[PDB]
Amino acid sequence: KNVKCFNCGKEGHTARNCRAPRKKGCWKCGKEGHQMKDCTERQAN
DNA sequence: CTGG
Ligand SMILES: [Zn+2]
Ligand SMILES: [Zn+2]
Numbered sequence: 001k002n003v004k005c006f007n008c009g010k011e012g013h014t015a016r017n018c019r020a021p022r023k024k025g026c027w028k029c030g031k032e033g034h035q036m037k038d039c040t041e042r043q044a045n
Numbered sequence: 046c047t048g049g
Pocket of ligand 2: 001025026028030031032034036038040041
């Protein structure tokens with residue numbers, strides 16, 4: 001879809017789809033033990 | 046925009 005992947009960089013898909021290795025922690029937030037949104041990725045408030 |  002002409003989108004660069006969060007942790008792989010290659011386009012035509014998204015992080016999870018990319019064959020390359022996945023990020024251990026949250027992509028947007030970094031932390032570990034959850035998805036991307038669940039963690040303080042963007043001031044949950 | 047896209048999400049594990
Ligand atoms: Zn990728
Ligand atoms: Zn996080």
